[PDB]
Design a protein around this motif. Structure first.
Motif, PDB file in Angstrom:
ATOM      1  N   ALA A   1     -16.761 -46.242   8.238  1.00 49.00           N
ATOM      2  CA  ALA A   1     -15.589 -46.924   8.778  1.00 49.00           C
ATOM      3  C   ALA A   1     -15.436 -46.679  10.274  1.00 49.00           C
ATOM      4  CB  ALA A   1     -14.331 -46.479   8.034  1.00 49.00           C
ATOM      5  N   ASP A   2     -15.806 -45.486  10.746  1.00 49.88           N
ATOM      6  CA  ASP A   2     -15.721 -45.184  12.171  1.00 49.88           C
ATOM      7  C   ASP A   2     -16.631 -46.092  12.987  1.00 49.88           C
ATOM      8  OD1 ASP A   2     -14.698 -43.142  14.273  1.00 49.88           O
ATOM      9  OD2 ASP A   2     -16.873 -43.136  14.578  1.00 49.88           O
ATOM     10  N   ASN A   3     -17.843 -46.353  12.492  1.00 49.06           N
ATOM     11  CA  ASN A   3     -18.729 -47.291  13.177  1.00 49.06           C
ATOM     12  C   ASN A   3     -18.135 -48.692  13.214  1.00 49.06           C
ATOM     13  OD1 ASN A   3     -21.091 -49.460  12.853  1.00 49.06           O
ATOM     14  ND2 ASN A   3     -21.874 -47.752  14.083  1.00 49.06           N
ATOM     15  N   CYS A   4     -17.297 -49.027  12.237  1.00 49.61           N
ATOM     16  CA  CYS A   4     -16.666 -50.335  12.187  1.00 49.61           C
ATOM     17  C   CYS A   4     -15.551 -50.448  13.223  1.00 49.61           C
ATOM     18  CB  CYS A   4     -16.107 -50.602  10.792  1.00 49.61           C
ATOM     19  SG  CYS A   4     -15.363 -52.225  10.612  1.00 49.61           S
ATOM     20  N   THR A   5     -15.151 -51.690  13.493  1.00 50.20           N
ATOM     21  CA  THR A   5     -14.063 -51.984  14.418  1.00 50.20           C
ATOM     22  C   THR A   5     -13.003 -52.892  13.812  1.00 50.20           C
ATOM     23  OG1 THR A   5     -13.561 -52.778  16.663  1.00 50.20           O
ATOM     24  CG2 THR A   5     -15.295 -53.943  15.443  1.00 50.20           C
ATOM     25  N   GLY A   6     -13.391 -53.806  12.925  1.00 53.85           N
ATOM     26  CA  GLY A   6     -12.464 -54.760  12.347  1.00 53.85           C
ATOM     27  C   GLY A   6     -12.446 -54.750  10.834  1.00 53.85           C
ATOM     28  N   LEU A   7     -12.484 -53.557  10.240  1.00 49.25           N
ATOM     29  CA  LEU A   7     -12.603 -53.414   8.793  1.00 49.25           C
ATOM     30  C   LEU A   7     -11.510 -54.178   8.062  1.00 49.25           C
ATOM     31  CD1 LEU A   7     -13.801 -50.313   6.974  1.00 49.25           C
ATOM     32  CD2 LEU A   7     -11.674 -51.324   6.153  1.00 49.25           C
ATOM     33  N   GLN A   8     -11.918 -55.207   7.319  1.00 48.75           N
ATOM     34  CA  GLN A   8     -10.968 -55.979   6.525  1.00 48.75           C
ATOM     35  C   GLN A   8     -10.461 -55.164   5.341  1.00 48.75           C
ATOM     36  OE1 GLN A   8      -9.738 -59.108   7.024  1.00 48.75           O
ATOM     37  NE2 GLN A   8     -10.834 -59.417   8.959  1.00 48.75           N
ATOM     38  N   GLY A   9     -11.371 -54.524   4.617  1.00 44.90           N
ATOM     39  CA  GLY A   9     -11.000 -53.724   3.464  1.00 44.90           C
ATOM     40  C   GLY A   9     -12.236 -53.310   2.699  1.00 44.90           C
ATOM     41  N   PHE A  10     -12.022 -52.452   1.708  1.00 53.09           N
ATOM     42  CA  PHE A  10     -13.092 -52.036   0.815  1.00 53.09           C
ATOM     43  C   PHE A  10     -13.160 -52.953  -0.399  1.00 53.09           C
ATOM     44  CE2 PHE A  10     -13.450 -48.041   3.098  1.00 53.09           C
ATOM     45  CZ  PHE A  10     -12.163 -47.815   3.535  1.00 53.09           C
ATOM     46  N   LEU A  11     -14.332 -52.983  -1.031  1.00 57.16           N
ATOM     47  CA  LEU A  11     -14.511 -53.658  -2.310  1.00 57.16           C
ATOM     48  C   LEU A  11     -15.560 -52.901  -3.109  1.00 57.16           C
ATOM     49  CD1 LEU A  11     -17.349 -55.654  -2.257  1.00 57.16           C
ATOM     50  CD2 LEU A  11     -15.899 -56.886  -0.658  1.00 57.16           C
ATOM     51  N   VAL A  12     -15.290 -52.692  -4.397  1.00 53.03           N
ATOM     52  CA  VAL A  12     -16.041 -51.753  -5.221  1.00 53.03           C
ATOM     53  C   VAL A  12     -16.703 -52.493  -6.374  1.00 53.03           C
ATOM     54  CG1 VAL A  12     -14.372 -49.972  -4.612  1.00 53.03           C
ATOM     55  CG2 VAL A  12     -14.166 -51.167  -6.798  1.00 53.03           C
ATOM     56  N   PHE A  13     -17.779 -51.908  -6.898  1.00 52.84           N
ATOM     57  CA  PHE A  13     -18.421 -52.360  -8.124  1.00 52.84           C
ATOM     58  C   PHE A  13     -18.599 -51.164  -9.048  1.00 52.84           C
ATOM     59  CE2 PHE A  13     -19.709 -54.964  -4.621  1.00 52.84           C
ATOM     60  CZ  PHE A  13     -19.690 -56.264  -5.081  1.00 52.84           C
ATOM     61  N   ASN A  14     -18.201 -51.320 -10.308  1.00 47.69           N
ATOM     62  CA  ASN A  14     -18.369 -50.257 -11.289  1.00 47.69           C
ATOM     63  C   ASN A  14     -18.176 -50.828 -12.684  1.00 47.69           C
ATOM     64  OD1 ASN A  14     -15.646 -50.717 -10.776  1.00 47.69           O
ATOM     65  ND2 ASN A  14     -15.036 -48.636 -11.354  1.00 47.69           N
ATOM     66  N   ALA A  15     -18.656 -50.081 -13.673  1.00 44.27           N
ATOM     67  CA  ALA A  15     -18.429 -50.379 -15.080  1.00 44.27           C
ATOM     68  C   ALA A  15     -17.629 -49.242 -15.697  1.00 44.27           C
ATOM     69  CB  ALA A  15     -19.751 -50.572 -15.825  1.00 44.27           C
ATOM     70  N   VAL A  16     -16.474 -49.576 -16.284  1.00 44.91           N
ATOM     71  CA  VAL A  16     -15.576 -48.554 -16.819  1.00 44.91           C
ATOM     72  C   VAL A  16     -16.043 -47.984 -18.146  1.00 44.91           C
ATOM     73  CG1 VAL A  16     -13.663 -49.711 -15.671  1.00 44.91           C
ATOM     74  CG2 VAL A  16     -14.102 -50.144 -18.093  1.00 44.91           C
ATOM     75  N   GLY A  17     -17.158 -48.465 -18.687  1.00 38.22           N
ATOM     76  CA  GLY A  17     -17.677 -47.937 -19.933  1.00 38.22           C
ATOM     77  C   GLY A  17     -18.499 -46.676 -19.762  1.00 38.22           C
ATOM     78  N   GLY A  18     -19.035 -46.468 -18.563  1.00 38.18           N
ATOM     79  CA  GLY A  18     -19.886 -45.330 -18.290  1.00 38.18           C
ATOM     80  C   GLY A  18     -19.104 -44.093 -17.903  1.00 38.18           C
ATOM     81  N   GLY A  19     -19.837 -43.088 -17.432  1.00 40.44           N
ATOM     82  CA  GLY A  19     -19.232 -41.840 -17.010  1.00 40.44           C
ATOM     83  C   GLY A  19     -18.997 -41.761 -15.516  1.00 40.44           C
ATOM     84  N   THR A  20     -20.021 -42.099 -14.729  1.00 38.96           N
ATOM     85  CA  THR A  20     -19.880 -42.057 -13.277  1.00 38.96           C
ATOM     86  C   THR A  20     -18.959 -43.165 -12.778  1.00 38.96           C
ATOM     87  OG1 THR A  20     -22.109 -41.132 -13.110  1.00 38.96           O
ATOM     88  CG2 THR A  20     -21.123 -42.021 -11.102  1.00 38.96           C
ATOM     89  N   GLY A  21     -19.141 -44.386 -13.283  1.00 43.75           N
ATOM     90  CA  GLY A  21     -18.307 -45.490 -12.834  1.00 43.75           C
ATOM     91  C   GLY A  21     -16.848 -45.316 -13.207  1.00 43.75           C
ATOM     92  N   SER A  22     -16.584 -44.870 -14.435  1.00 41.72           N
ATOM     93  CA  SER A  22     -15.209 -44.709 -14.891  1.00 41.72           C
ATOM     94  C   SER A  22     -14.607 -43.396 -14.403  1.00 41.72           C
ATOM     95  CB  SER A  22     -15.150 -44.794 -16.417  1.00 41.72           C
ATOM     96  OG  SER A  22     -13.976 -44.181 -16.920  1.00 41.72           O
ATOM     97  N   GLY A  23     -15.307 -42.286 -14.625  1.00 41.08           N
ATOM     98  CA  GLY A  23     -14.793 -40.978 -14.264  1.00 41.08           C
ATOM     99  C   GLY A  23     -14.703 -40.738 -12.772  1.00 41.08           C
ATOM    100  N   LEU A  24     -15.851 -40.756 -12.093  1.00 41.19           N
ATOM    101  CA  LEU A  24     -15.874 -40.522 -10.654  1.00 41.19           C
ATOM    102  C   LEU A  24     -15.180 -41.634  -9.880  1.00 41.19           C
ATOM    103  CD1 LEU A  24     -18.969 -39.062  -8.874  1.00 41.19           C
ATOM    104  CD2 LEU A  24     -17.568 -40.743  -7.692  1.00 41.19           C
ATOM    105  N   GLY A  25     -15.195 -42.862 -10.402  1.00 36.69           N
ATOM    106  CA  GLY A  25     -14.543 -43.961  -9.711  1.00 36.69           C
ATOM    107  C   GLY A  25     -13.054 -43.739  -9.531  1.00 36.69           C
ATOM    108  N   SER A  26     -12.390 -43.206 -10.559  1.00 41.39           N
ATOM    109  CA  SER A  26     -10.959 -42.937 -10.457  1.00 41.39           C
ATOM    110  C   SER A  26     -10.656 -41.950  -9.337  1.00 41.39           C
ATOM    111  CB  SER A  26     -10.435 -42.409 -11.790  1.00 41.39           C
ATOM    112  OG  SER A  26      -9.020 -42.431 -11.828  1.00 41.39           O
ATOM    113  N   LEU A  27     -11.378 -40.827  -9.304  1.00 39.86           N
ATOM    114  CA  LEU A  27     -11.162 -39.828  -8.263  1.00 39.86           C
ATOM    115  C   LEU A  27     -11.472 -40.389  -6.882  1.00 39.86           C
ATOM    116  CD1 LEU A  27     -10.329 -36.882  -7.838  1.00 39.86           C
ATOM    117  CD2 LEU A  27     -12.739 -36.243  -8.074  1.00 39.86           C
TER     118      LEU A  27
END
Ligand SMILES: Nc1nc2c(ncn2[C@@H]2O[C@H](COP(=O)(O)OP(=O)(O)OP(=O)(O)O)[C@@H](O)[C@H]2O)c(=O)[nH]1
Ligand SMILES: Nc1nc2c(ncn2[C@@H]2O[C@H](COP(=O)(O)OP(=O)(O)O)[C@@H](O)[C@H]2O)c(=O)[nH]1
Ligand SMILES: Nc1nc2c(ncn2[C@@H]2O[C@H](COP(=O)(O)OP(=O)(O)O)[C@@H](O)[C@H]2O)c(=O)[nH]1
Ligand SMILES: [Mg+2]
Ligand SMILES: [Mg+2]
Lengths: 436, 431, 52, 92, 426, 427
Positions: free
Chosen positions: A125-151
């Motif tokens: 984000a620091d390298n950026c100048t006009g950051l519109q926003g974040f957008l994520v991809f994950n599957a809530v059925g797994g462990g990393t996508g569901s578990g780590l995604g929340s945190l």
């Protein structure tokens, strides 16, 4: 204007692999890193800046991080064709998997890698100048996508605040599914996706399977085709930012014209025309029929019927040979059809977006090169029945306390199970009252 | 000597201003390079109203560009006459209001209004006698509606005696782009009814109607609509720039068209507009000008004049014409259709004549008629606004930015008693 | 077997039967009463009529 | 000698420029599940595209591009014929 | 000056108007491209009545074309003299009535008459002194009978003082096209008897008889019948367009043929009409015109005047002529068969003289006779109407649109009282 | 203006195969699908250089649809338009009305809307089916019911095939025909009668083809359809559109059954010698031996008539011919219809199919009238329906599917009421 995308889980970085291949082919970036030709057509110069950052020169590294706990797929990405494109420091990989365990990936394993993910995305984000926003991809059925995604989303929210976080999640299909304990992960992911994601886009896997078997007639579809369709959707979504159009719309347009209340953000995705190469030649391409096909339940990306619900707001992204007059005529035609209804909340529940560059085609893909396309994002009340349908089969498991010993051992307890159940019930009540 | 400064708000405002400056620069015969190349000597004597002389026969427009997204700066410099504007006049922020009235009126407009205020104060005092301010903008967007009307207000407490034009397009349900159109439109009208001297109402629905039925074009893009708006905006200010048999400044039309200070909403027409297929069946006479000028299908607003009454009307004629024919046509159109004109105002029609027609034409006309049928569109917007606001849809995007629930209620009340005033003045008796 | 030779025959010497107009016993021409070809129909199929 | 017939065919299709790209589309669309075309269908396509070629030339072309294992005049290899026609078209 | 505005309805009306405008344009010397190319100066002074100066000697007809099907407009534009009509005058619906009075009178008329009224009001107010309106249409079709009738009523409500002609063709049992012709014909007549100012009845079977016996043609296409109708219509307003020894406008004709306002149904004939083979062997004199004008077999209506009484009569004459011979022939025909003229009105024939004959001719004549034999065809239609209405055939298409039985009953009631008064005055 | 045609069952899509071949031949469209604006009522200018028919084939047995997919017109048909089920109804109205149809009919009527929205001047639907079979009768009735509820006011013409009086190809066809006509009563706007022995006799006596198959039958049925759609397609002196049929041919809402005829049905060798004129081709279109239905209107009374003329015809000749027909007393009209004719003239001559048995002609006539011998047709069918229903043969097939005997009795009394209405109106 720039947007940075983070991909969580095994399916997340596969979707990212499709999306970034499509982006490199669309912006003319050779996978080694440089652009053979400096000339530009259509959007004009400086178009690539929202996805690729000008590092040194002769290279354009994507503004993305692949974060995952199992190293196998990340190393496969590292060893494949796109070694030089991705930075070695952005492909974050753990050492052991979360094992379909929200507790494990949310309290035991995610704690040692979320800090590295945050202190890399901070300088992204620091390298950026006009950051519109974040957008994520994950599957809530797994462990990393569901578990780590929340945190990760919680820490992103506390570190940045009101910044847009578009959520492209993958829910388990009501009948077709791959895992067993996934209702627990899905519910414990919803309890935070409610209050952290700005706009959530639902994506069921069986709906895209039906689209592929029905429209593109691949009788044996795999995950690659699904990822390619998701990539086409995301590209048609960000084409307004990337290239010039008649009525360009940015990221903070969606939250303004599709989110009537902060806790109601769940979008059904739709795309048209999803047609094969042979069907493309006998079928005409005009705004009217591709707009009509964008509202049929048979071409939706989520296994739900909008006829059982009421449309609250709709969003229409157009690409290619599209002018304001015929899209206005088409959207006027839709309002005459009494089969689909709009809630009395919003009489003008439409927002159109027109772009000029037609969607690109990838060699080896199955979609045909067309003159125009439509990407539809709407808000209705079938999300309420989807959540309750998942809720029933989640509550089937919990009555006998099955698989609960796995979660408690990692460090969580059973109280948050009950509060997530209550949160889902409250969401059902909210959707039902809104439907009135 | 009589000076008009131009202010452009939003993407629509910038494109409309680009077309307007193209057509005006063509009218005074200056090339896209920016130097003089005209033929008639009558042009050079009255170019101070719109242009400032820089150096070596080079004239720069007296315009200010104001919006919140760089794509519009790319668009302005893309077409011809894009290198004639002074770069210092491109006052510009880069966040983007994003179809939000609150963002363009409380969050983003607050800090960027001072730079554009500096620019307009610098440019307005650079001339001797300001005729007034002219602004073209929209009521649908955020950077054009909210910021535009805040600038309107600011100029109003700064310069209270100068004239004020507002060519504003109002969104319609027939052709609706965004979702929150009534939310922005109602508050923009609430501010305009108190600040603007007079408003010249446009609409994309009527422009599409004109380009489809009358002009019979195949693909009427925004270019054609902006050309029609630019032709109107050139026709309204013709008297100042050229001599005529009966001149008519902006203040003259304002005093001859506005009977009460709050009744300053007009509807727009232009003449002539004929398809090239019907071109060789046409005649060149005053009767065919007044035949299409008064037509209800030629109005650039989505409000039928025959649904109400004509309070006052005006017509601006250009070209070598006879005053007798204009006067007798006006008298005939007033007397024959005697039920559509208000009774307590005799001689409802005011007229003016100019000798220099627009380039490529021999004769033309422009209609500005203050009618009480224009409250039809205000009710059409207020019904959607009260449908949404009844149960607080999309309200968190406004109240979560500094605004309160009182502003919406006051906007509703002001729009309601405005349409009530129009209705009462429509049904008033002469005795 | 019924259709293939028919297609070959109509492809060998493709001639389309043009609309013949019976000539009256006068110098005047029949001037058919109606026509499905013209600008009125083209105006009718313009898509802008749908929006209103 | 089917090569001379193919040269004559491509030279004839050089005129009426829309007739060259149409023939490849006809071959691809009317193609079988494999790259097989019947002689009757080939003659039908040749007549439809506007090419008037003597029947002996059509027979020579069929024999030149006949698939292996069939009657010498029953069928035609669509893919091979199209690929070899592309080179002849781009050569002139 | 005095202005004639033309209105055309239905396919029949459109073809009739196309032929009429071609004939008139030929008379006034304008080319099919629309530019004047005539010789005499008499062809400029009185062309405002039909045309409008555009630019550079371009004249546009004062016509409004009405229909509900694209075929009629397409054929009009495709044919010769089709590039002189102003496209804005092509007021045009889309769905079509299709041989149903109710569709063209209640449903389809509702959304189409507004544009027709707009265009007719726009053109009529453009001219200074409108002499009157002119309408040619059909009583068999749907968009010609119902929509034309609605327009007639609307014009009568809007411009009441102006004149109005109605060249309406009435279908006959011998030459019958459509099954439901009585349903449209009776109601159209019921509206016409109060709405239209004066009516001149045409019929296709009479035209076929004329083109068979007189013109001796073997294939009488619609072109010949439309030519005859166009010649008749052009002959009516000849005095307005050219000077004469005794002029007569439309009101002057109406006042001398309507002793009672509900008797305005005329029977029409034209002369001379000779075959091309017999064109050499005829001398061209006033008696040769008068003897053929009064012949029963020359009338363009399906009514024999020998079965009734010539209540009033009229005659329009074109060419450089002797008034003495015209008057002597009229007196001779009055005094020879005194049983065919009513007793309480002496001198029933009105005469007028124009010195400009139609192109290619030296002498011509036109007849407009208000006879009481016009009630023969009314009974001939009302008998079919009563025979079919008594069993409610095809009624469900009329009732299920807004109409009910009362409109029908009043229809034959007015039909009966009109025919009863016509019989009474015999 | 556009018209879209739906074809049901094994018979419907073969008739469509003939009809669309004729249509492509008329407008000069190659079987690939492209020409080397009058065609707009059948074909859509899709993409670049291609015409696609506004048609759907739907059937439950996949064999015939699949053979169509591999025929001569492979690339002519838009691939998703050719609907094909998984298993047929096997001559069972109940099986095709309650069990299989509910899955395929929804997709079929979803896809017809993809054609309706493309249409801007849609005149109305027209259906091809045979009530003798299972999927044409059972599923077809459901499809027509849902078309009626979904659209309603739009016209739905019908060209059905009831079993012929003695010659038939099945056993349980009385049940199918009765249970089909019970719904055909109040759902279709105009029904055109078509039998097989009548066409066989026409091909035997006139075109002297000793061994005709379904190909010739479908060819001349397509000729009739083309002659009745030419008024919308091409330009004529005096045309009639679709609505004209329901305006001038159905005096009552419950009486919509049309006897069809065609003339001249002539071969190549006889064409040269006969001097084909309007008078005799009009005369031939009225003889019972040249009708498409095995019934004689001489037993009944004509209620209406529709005459279609193509090519070198003038209104004077047709008026003379209709006058001569009206003066004849061999045929008698009903007393309450004095002007029961409606003439339609078109200038485009009928085109000839190479390899076919018809020849080039300058003029042709397609007659569609309403009479009272159709009540005789229905009564003769009802006789043999009630004959075998007394011993309840084959009924165990129907009851097991889900229906009951209530439908049998209600359809029987509905047919009886139809006979009563026909005999009353003919009085
Ligand atoms: N005129 C004509 N009749 C046909 C044709 N094909 C079938 N039929 C008739 O249709 C009747 C039976 O209906 P079919 O269409 O063959 O069968 P179906 O509609 O598919 O019903 P199922 O066989 O149960 O699936 C037979 O008695 C034939 O007389 C045809 O091509 N032309
Ligand atoms: N006439 C005209 N209307 C326009 C133009 N550009 C945009 N609009 C209309 O303005 C509305 C939205 O304005 P918007 O782009 O949001 O303005 P902004 O965001 O304030 O700069 C849409 O409904 C368009 O129809 C233009 O160039 N001409
Ligand atoms: N005299 C004459 N009669 C015509 C002409 N065209 C049609 N008709 C008659 O008009 C009748 C049908 O009228 P129709 O076309 O239905 O009128 P519409 O439906 O109102 O447009 C037929 O009986 C024809 O005899 C024509 O050019 N001249
Ligand atoms: Mg995982
Ligand atoms: Mg079958």
């Amino acid at each position: 204007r720039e947007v940075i995308s983070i991909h969580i889980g095994q399916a997340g970085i596969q979707v990212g692999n499709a999306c970034w291949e499509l982006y490199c082919l669309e912006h003319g970036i050779q996978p080694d890193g440089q652009m053979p030709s400096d000339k530009t057509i259509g959007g004009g110069d400086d178009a690539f800046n929202t996805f690729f950052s000008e590092t040194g020169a002769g290279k354009h590294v994507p503004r993305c991080i692949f974060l995952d706990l199992e190293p196998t797929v990340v190393d496969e990405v590292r060893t494949g064709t796109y070694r030089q494109l991705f930075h070695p420091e952005q492909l974050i990989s753990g050492k052991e998997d979360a094992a379909n365990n929200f507790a494990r990936g949310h309290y035991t394993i995610g704690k040692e890698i979320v800090d590295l993910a945050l202190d890399r995305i901070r300088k992204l984000a620091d390298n950026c100048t006009g950051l519109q926003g974040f957008l994520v991809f994950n599957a809530v059925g797994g462990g990393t996508g569901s578990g780590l995604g929340s945190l990760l989303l919680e820490r992103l929210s506390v570190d940045y605040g009101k910044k847009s976080k578009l959520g492209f999640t993958v829910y388990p299909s009501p009948q077709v599914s791959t895992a067993v304990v996934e209702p627990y992960n899905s519910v414990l992911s919803t309890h935070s996706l409610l209050e952290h994601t700005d706009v959530a886009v639902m994506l069921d896997n069986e709906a895209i399977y039906d689209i592929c078997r029905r429209s593109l007639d691949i009788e044996r579809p795999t995950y690659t085709n699904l990822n390619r369709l998701i990539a086409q959707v995301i590209s048609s979504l960000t084409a307004s930012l990337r290239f010039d159009g008649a009525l360009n719309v940015d990221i903070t347009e969606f939250q303004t014209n599709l989110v009537p209340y902060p806790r109601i953000h769940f979008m059904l995705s739709s795309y048209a025309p999803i047609i094969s190469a042979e069907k493309a030649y006998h079928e005409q391409l005009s705004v009217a029929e591709i707009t009509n096909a964008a509202f049929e339940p048979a071409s939706m990306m989520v296994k739900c019927d909008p006829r059982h619900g009421k449309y609250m707001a709709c969003c229409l992204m157009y690409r290619g040979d599209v002018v304001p007059k015929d899209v206005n005529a088409s959207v006027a035609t839709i309002k005459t059809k009494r089969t689909i209804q709009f809630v009395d909340w919003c009489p003008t529940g439409f927002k159109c977006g027109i772009n000029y560059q037609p969607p690109t085609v990838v060699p080896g893909g199955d979609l045909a090169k067309v003159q125009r396309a439509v990407c539809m994002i709407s808000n209705s009340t079938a999300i309420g029945e989807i959540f309750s349908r998942l809720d029933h089969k989640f509550d089937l498991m919990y009555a006998k306390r099955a698989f609960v010993h796995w979660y408690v051992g990692e460090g969580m307890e059973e109280g948050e199970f009950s509060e997530a159940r209550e949160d889902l019930a409250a969401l059902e009540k909210d959707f039902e009252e809104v439907g009135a | 000597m009589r000076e008009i400064v131009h202010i452009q708000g939003g993407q629509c405002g910038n494109q409309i201003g680009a077309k307007f400056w193209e057509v005006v620069s063509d009218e005074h015969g200056i090339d896209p390079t920016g130097t003089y190349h005209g033929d008639s000597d009558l042009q050079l004597e009255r170019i101070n109203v719109y242009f400032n002389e820089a150096t070596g026969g080079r004239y720069v427009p007296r315009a200010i560009l104001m919006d919140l997204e760089p794509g519009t700066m790319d668009s302005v410099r893309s077409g011809p006459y894009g290198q004639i504007f002074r770069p210092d006049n491109f006052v510009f922020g880069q966040t983007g209001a994003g179809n939000n009235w609150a963002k363009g009126h409380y969050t983003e407009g607050a800090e960027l209004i001072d730079s554009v205020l500096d620019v307009v104060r610098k440019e307005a005092e650079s001339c001797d006698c300001l005729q007034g301010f002219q602004v073209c903008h929209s009521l649908g967007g955020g950077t054009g509606s909210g910021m535009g009307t805040l600038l309107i207000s600011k100029i109003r407490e700064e310069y209270p005696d100068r004239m004020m034009l507002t060519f504003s397009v109002v969104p319609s349900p027939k052709v609706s782009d965004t979702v929150v159109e009534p939310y922005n439109a109602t508050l923009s009208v609430h501010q305009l009814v108190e600040n603007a001297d007079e408003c010249m109402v446009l609409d994309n629905e009527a422009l599409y109607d004109i380009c489809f039925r009358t002009l019979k074009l195949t693909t009427p893009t925004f270019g054609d609509l902006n050309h029609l708006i630019s032709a109107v905006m050139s026709g309204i200010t013709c008297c100042l720039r050229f001599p005529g048999q009966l001149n008519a400044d902006l203040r003259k039309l304002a005093v001859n068209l506005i009977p009460f200070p709050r009744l300053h909403f007009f509807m727009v027409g232009f003449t002539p507009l004929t398809s090239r297929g019907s071109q060789q069946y046409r005649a060149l006479t005053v009767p065919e000008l007044t035949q299409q000028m008064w037509d209800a299908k030629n109005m650039m607003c989505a409000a039928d004049p025959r649904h109400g009454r004509y309070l006052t009307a005006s017509a601006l004629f250009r070209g070598r014409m006879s005053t007798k024919e204009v006067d007798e046509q006006m008298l005939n159109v007033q007397n024959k259709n005697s039920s559509y004109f208000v009774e307590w105002i005799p001689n409802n029609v005011k007229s003016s004549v100019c000798d220099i027609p627009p380039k490529g034409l021999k004769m033309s006309a422009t209609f500005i008629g203050n009618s009480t049928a224009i409250q039809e569109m205000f009710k059409r917007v207020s019904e959607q606004f009260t449908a949404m606001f009844r149960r607080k849809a999309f309200l968190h995007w406004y109240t979560g930015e500094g605004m309160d629930e009182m502003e919406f209620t006051e906007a509703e009340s002001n729009m309601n008693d405005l349409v009530s005033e129009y209705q009462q003045y429509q049904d008033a008796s002469a005795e | 077997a019924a259709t293939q030779p028919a297609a070959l025959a109509t492809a060998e010497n493709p001639t389309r039967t043009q609309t013949l107009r019976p000539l009256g016993d006068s110098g005047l021409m029949p001037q058919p009463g109606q026509k499905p070809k013209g600008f009125a129909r083209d105006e009718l199929d313009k898509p802008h009529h749908r929006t209103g | 000698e089917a090569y001379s017939f193919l040269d004559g065919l491509v030279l004839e299709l050089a005129s009426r420029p829309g007739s060259l790209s149409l023939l490849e589309r006809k071959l691809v669309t009317l193609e079988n599940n494999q790259s097989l075309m019947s002689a009757e269908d080939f003659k039908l396509v040749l007549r439809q595209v506007g090419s008037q070629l003597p029947e002996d030339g059509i027979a020579a072309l069929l024999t030149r591009y006949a698939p292996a294992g069939s009657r010498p005049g029953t069928r035609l290899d669509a893919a091979a014929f199209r690929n070899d026609l592309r080179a002849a078209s781009t050569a002139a």
